[PDB]
């Protein structure tokens, strides 16, 4: 979702150690900026793809329904 | 024709020449290896070991395989000269802690199932 956050890219001009150190410090500041944006815009919903042939089902479903148990077995073996 | 391309040598003569140059270099280097690594073996032992390694691949009749073997031998010599190898690496050629295994049928029958 990196197209939905705002931040700047630090750029050096000397190509030496000092400029790269300044760039890393500025990148830490930009990371704090992005973290703020991510904290404010966290949406609700599921956290893995709703496709049990890829992502394992929930434990409650695995102990309740036949297809969920089959897919859990096959995805973990 | 079989249409194959060379590595370095055109036929077996040039390959043998490269083999002889590599052997000369290793033979010259052996005493320096004995001195620098502080080995308890003699120079004669090292040169016999060098001779033994060459003899192992004596049977090969393909110039490309010989060329690759010479490249590997030069790499090994470079590792030895620069002391990138340690004493353990040099002594690994001698298999000093491996118990001898008999090649006779009776000895193998007695110890286990392996042929």
């Amino acid at each position: 979702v990196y197209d939905q956050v705002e931040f700047d890219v630090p750029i050096g001009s000397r190509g030496d150690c000092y400029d790269r150190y300044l760039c890393r410090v500025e990148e830490m500041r930009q990371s704090l900026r992005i973290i703020s944006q991510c904290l404010n815009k966290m949406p609700p919903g599921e956290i893995k793809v709703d496709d049990a042939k890829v992502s394992p089902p929930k434990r409650a479903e695995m102990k309740t329904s036949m297809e969920s148990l089959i897919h859990h077995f096959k995805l973990y073996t | 024709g079989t249409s194959v391309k060379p590595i370095f040598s055109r036929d077996m003569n040039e390959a043998k020449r490269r083999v002889r140059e590599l052997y000369r270099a290793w033979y010259r280097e052996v005493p320096n290896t004995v001195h620098l690594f502080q080995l308890d073996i003699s120079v004669k032992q090292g040169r016999d070991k060098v001779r033994e390694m060459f003899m192992k691949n004596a049977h090969v009749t393909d110039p490309r395989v010989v060329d690759l073997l010479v490249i590997k031998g030069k790499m090994e010599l470079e590792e030895t000269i620069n002391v990138w190898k340690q004493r353990t690496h040099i002594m690994r050629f001698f298999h000093e802690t491996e118990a001898p295994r008999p090649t006779d049928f009776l000895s193998k029958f007695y110890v286990g199932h392996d042929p």
């Binding site: - | 079989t2 194959v4 060379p6 036929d11 090969v60 393909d62 395989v65 690759l68 073997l69």
Partner: protein, 125 residues
């Protein structure tokens, strides 16, 4: 230009394999048999090369299974039998080839379940 080698391909001196695991090994080139517990045939399409089984013994401390041969798990996949044969030959391994087993076509007739005068009529459904 080219040199036109007239020898047989042989790379054993360059593979780093110890001599014992070259001359004393027997490889098997075969199409694996279908597992009889299932009807799927997708595991009977490719050729397999595998090594001869060596000794396994129980570990004294935990009773685990211990081996001393490094090729006990090596299995190679090939598109054709000729490819596997060429690989085995250039690696210096002596091999045994088994021809592919294909189930023969069968004549199925659902109507034969109810024959007027043959023994193929079924007593139950």
């Amino acid at each position: 230009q080219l040199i036109a080698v007239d020898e047989k391909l042989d790379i054993t001196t360059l593979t780093g394999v110890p001599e014992e695991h070259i001359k004393t090994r027997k490889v098997r080139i075969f199409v694996p048999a279908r597992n009889n517990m299932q009807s799927g045939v997708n595991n009977t399409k490719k050729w397999k090369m595998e090594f001869d089984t060596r000794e396994r013994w129980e570990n004294p401390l935990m009773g685990w299974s211990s081996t001393a041969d490094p090729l006990s798990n090596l299995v190679l996949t090939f598109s054709t039998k000729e490819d596997a044969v060429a690989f085995a030959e250039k690696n210096g391994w002596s091999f045994d080839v088994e021809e592919r087993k294909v189930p023969k076509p069968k004549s199925k007739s659902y109507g034969a379940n109810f024959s007027w005068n043959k023994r193929t009529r079924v007593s139950t459904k």
